[PDB]
Enzyme design. Structure first.
Site: not given
Ligand SMILES: O=C(Cc1cccc(Cl)c1)Nc1nnc2ccccn12
Ligand SMILES: O=C(Cc1cccc(Cl)c1)Nc1nnc2ccccn12
Lengths: 304, 304
Positions: A41, A143, A145
């Site tokens: 992603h 950030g 990820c």
């Molecule tokens: O969730 C996401 C972005 C995303 C959205 C939809 C699918 C995917 Cl694969 C990735 N990033 C993320 N990961 N841990 C946190 C924690 C707090 C904010 C954002 N965070």
């Protein structure tokens, strides 16, 4: 004596963290040998995440669009490929800090350490477990990820998790290092609810053994039970069924304490039925399930 | 989202761990520049620990009696001195992995990470706090002495603790890196009981702010209180008195959440008086006091 939620020393993994930027998205990558692994992603914009076609989005990307920085120095990307939900960026330089390593796919109930990172820099390390619903209860911000989960056996790091996503309920989902998600989750901004977060029974029993070894014994009772009777109670309390395989894995803890596994099950049954009555076990007022039997033995023996 | 008991990444400290042997005793040492720091009780036999005269015991020791091993390679000891309860072994080689560092003496209520080690090898990392009675609730086995406690600010490691002893109650005592014990403890096998382990009020309030930031809000009530009224309740529950200095340190968390510090105090007062009623806050069934206000901000902002 004393029992703590202990993480593996993180140095071997800190030496592998890099920053990966594609377009305006920046996340973490794991640099082992001449490959940098990161969530696919990273190629997505904010609008792309709703319904992304990763193969199509990747066509518009070339090696020079993936900026990989290790500390303050830039790595040259000489190839890129998608394996399931991760991208593998081939760089021209092998990571000189690459430890001995393996990629493993863990089962629910298994624990691991997470090195939370931002911009390729480590912020902290904590211990967690793969929940029976295939989520993890982490501590991740935007950030984070690409931060990884791992276990260490003397000098070999077994990487088991790469962070990808936060569900709307504040729980976390990710993949193994082959890019396959744990559970049914997909890397899309869509309705994804987690299943029942049941308690990891074998881990609770291991932690009760740890409590006895450390002197907390108030919960030991005069009773015993059977696997079938115990499992009726476990079902009622959303605990995972205990199998003979779990009983066998608890053998060394039963031998060390002289408390038969089924007797410990009877103690756990009374704790489920009666509650703690305002008391604590190992500084906790609830039954802890994120220590495996192997973790208890390791911490109680001092394996380095 | 999510809130975990997070330790600092331990790599910078792993690069400093060495093994020190004197006679038949082996423990851990911390190698910074050309000095190796370790507990002075490394010179003691089992019979010496009952009533040791460290100056007299040290007279019988020469540089060649201190065996210092860094990984698998031996360090040459060219000088030795006793500073309070630690020995400083001057070696002929500066540690090439010496990070930027400081020695700090912490106050009770302050948290730090511990890198538990055995035979100069790291086994695990966990987070803990200097209790108000000057003990720490660690996880240490025989051989763990000389393991250190530290905090990190970007690239500077501030060493604050060196492990020396386990009290008969399973709690731990140690020194700062100048060899002065925290609290009234002495490095002798003698009757040393710990005082009241009161709860670190300012840390509980910081953790309640962390809970609100992460979505756990059930405990927020319609009440407020004063410092004096709150402190009457805190005394009753063996909580440390809250001062205006503590209120000031909670300012950034109050600003982020819009919840006035005294309103959060009223929520904490009702939790003390009414209990949790079988509910949880941030996965805990008790009020957590080993996160400082700085820890909450750091974890909630992602400082690397
Ligand atoms: O969730 C996401 C972005 C995303 C959205 C939809 C699918 C995917 Cl694969 C990735 N990033 C993320 N990961 N841990 C946190 C924690 C707090 C904010 C954002 N965070
Ligand atoms: O307590 C001691 C030895 C000692 C005895 C008396 C005074 C002093 Cl300074 C040192 N070592 C130690 N430290 N942590 C643990 C944990 C489990 C067993 C032993 N542990």
């Amino acid at each position: 004596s004393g029992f703590r939620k202990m993480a593996f020393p993180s140095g071997k993994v800190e030496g592998c963290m890099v920053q990966v930027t594609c377009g305006t998205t920046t996340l973490n990558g794991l640099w082992l040998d001449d490959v940098v692994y990161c969530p696919r992603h990273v190629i997505c914009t904010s609008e792309d995440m709703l319904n992304p076609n990763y193969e199509d989005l990747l066509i518009r990307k070339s090696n020079h669009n993936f900026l990989v920085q290790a500390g303050n120095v830039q790595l040259r990307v000489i190839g890129h490929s998608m394996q399931n939900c991760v991208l593998k960026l081939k760089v021209d330089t092998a990571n000189p800090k690459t430890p001995k390593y393996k990629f493993v796919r863990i089962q629910p109930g298994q624990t691991f350490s997470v090195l939370a990172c931002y911009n390729g820099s480590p912020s902290g390390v904590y211990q967690c477990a793969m929940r029976p619903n295939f989520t993890i209860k982490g501590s991740f911000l935007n950030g984070s990820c690409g931060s990884v989960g791992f276990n260490i056996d003397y000098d070999c790091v077994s990487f088991c998790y790469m962070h990808h996503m936060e569900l709307p309920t504040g729980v976390h989902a990710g993949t193994d290092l082959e890019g396959n998600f744990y559970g049914p989750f997909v890397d899309r901004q869509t309705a994804q609810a987690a299943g029942t977060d049941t308690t990891i029974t074998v881990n609770v029993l291991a932690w009760l053994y740890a409590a006895v070894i450390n002197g907390d014994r108030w919960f030991l009772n005069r009773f015993t039970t059977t696997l079938n009777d115990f499992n009726l109670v476990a079902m009622k309390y959303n605990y995972e069924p205990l199998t003979q395989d779990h009983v066998d894995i608890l053998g060394p803890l039963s031998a060390q304490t002289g408390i038969a596994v089924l007797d410990m099950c009877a103690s756990l049954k009374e704790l489920l039925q009666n509650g703690m009555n305002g008391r604590t076990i190992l500084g906790s007022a609830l039954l802890e399930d994120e220590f495996t039997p192997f973790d208890v033995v390791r911490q109680c023996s001092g394996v380095t």
